[PDB]
DNA sequence: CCCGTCAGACGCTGCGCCGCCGGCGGCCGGAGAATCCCGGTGCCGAGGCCGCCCTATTGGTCGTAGACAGCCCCAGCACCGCCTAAACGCACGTACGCG
């Protein structure tokens, strides 16, 4: 079996890998749903991109 | 002759004119003092590149949030009538305000 990152089948640029990791760790919950990650990081690269 | 009336000239008063002076206002010339570029020079640090590995991705699972399906029932909403305090309009005037 062959990987792909997660981010390439968003289209997406950030680090959906790193960003569902931090929100694990940051007890913010005990459990996310897997799609909160996603939209999470398609946030920032549009608050990012907004800016520069 | 002088007074009296009216008339005419004088003196005084009020005015504008007249010239002077001042002040003001405006406008400008140009010094000149900064800022502003403009070009020459040289880094050091982006940026770029390479090694590498730890984490991200994959497969599987399993068990449990949570949907959802259904349900009861409070209590939020209508509305209805009677009441009056509460709101409203104006009437001054003086006092904050603004210059």
């Not at 680090?15 to 946030?43: D, I, M, Q, S, T």
């Amino acid at each position: 079996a062959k990987a792909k990152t997660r981010s390439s089948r968003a289209g997406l640029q950030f680090p959906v890998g790193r960003v569902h990791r931090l929100l694990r760790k940051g007890n913010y919950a005990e459990r996310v749903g897997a799609g909160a990650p996603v939209y999470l990081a398609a946030v920032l690269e549009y608050l990012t991109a907004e800016i520069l």
